[PDB]
Enzyme design. Structure first.
Site, PDB file in Angstrom:
ATOM      1  CD  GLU A   1      19.175  50.040 -59.657  1.00 26.81           C
ATOM      2  OE1 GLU A   1      19.800  48.957 -59.669  1.00 26.81           O
ATOM      3  OE2 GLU A   1      18.327  50.289 -58.740  1.00 26.81           O
TER       4      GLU A   1
ATOM      5  CD  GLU B   1      15.988  53.387 -54.388  1.00 24.48           C
ATOM      6  OE1 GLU B   1      17.042  54.029 -54.182  1.00 24.48           O
ATOM      7  OE2 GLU B   1      15.879  52.163 -54.143  1.00 24.48           O
TER       8      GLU B   1
END
Ligand SMILES: [Ca+2]
Length: 212
Positions: free
Chosen positions: A191, A195
């Site tokens: 991944e 964020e």
């Protein structure tokens, strides 16, 4: 576990900015409004993943996200996403004019569990009239929260990933843009993340996992 928190010099919740990561075999480079902010070179992911965006409230991670105080409804908005492929015939541009079930899917009816304290609902994934993806974090009953996750049906590899967005601002939550693959798709956990921690939208968190 390669978290990097960067100062933006602006409040990201006040308007649209362009965020991006260039994913190549030997590095990951992240940009904010065309400017290089961070480079990673150790153990760089290599498995093609889905493009995902979500908004959620957390539990048990108060030191990371701040405690969530139940404020709702909360919204994260996305004006477009662009992926520029390393291969011909891989590139695409998604304006978010409307729901396209051929290329995207809405999460619905389950929780990710863990740090995630909300249930995904297809109803919390909407399209504005001026073309924006709008994710919402709502409440259906006392202390019961509903959140939203939109994600591509196809998998994508090395190349330039860009997104124009405006995260939500509020203690306890996260608004994100990320690539993901993992045990549910039959592969190792690779991944790469962008964020925004709602407790301080003047900073952005960058991370990635390779065989997590
Ligand atoms: Ca748009």
């Amino acid at each position: 576990g390669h978290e990097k928190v960067i100062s933006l010099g602006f409040d990201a919740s006040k308007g649209f900015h362009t965020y991006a990561f260039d994913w190549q075999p030997g590095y990951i480079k992240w940009y904010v409004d065309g400017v290089l902010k961070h480079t990673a070179t150790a153990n760089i992911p290599s498995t093609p993943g889905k493009i995902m965006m979500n908004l959620w409230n957390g539990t048990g991670v108060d030191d990371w996200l701040g405690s969530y105080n139940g404020a709702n409804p909360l919204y994260a908005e996305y004006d477009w996403v662009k992926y520029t492929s390393n291969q011909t015939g891989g590139s695409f541009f998604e304006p978010f004019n409307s729901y396209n079930s051929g290329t995207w899917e809405k999460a619905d009816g389950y929780s990710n569990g863990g740090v995630f304290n909300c249930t995904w609902r297809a109803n919390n994934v909407n399209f504005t009239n001026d073309g924006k993806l709008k994710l919402g974090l709502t409440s259906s009953a006392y202390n019961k929260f509903d959140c939203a996750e939109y994600r591509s049906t196809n998998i994508y590899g090395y190349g330039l990933y860009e997104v124009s967005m405006k995260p939500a601002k509020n203690t306890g939550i996260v608004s994100s843009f990320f690539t993901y693959t993992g045990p549910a798709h039959g592969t190792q956990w690779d991944e790469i993340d962008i964020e925004f921690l709602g407790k301080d939208t003047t900073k952005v968190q960058f991370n990635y996992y390779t065989n997590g």
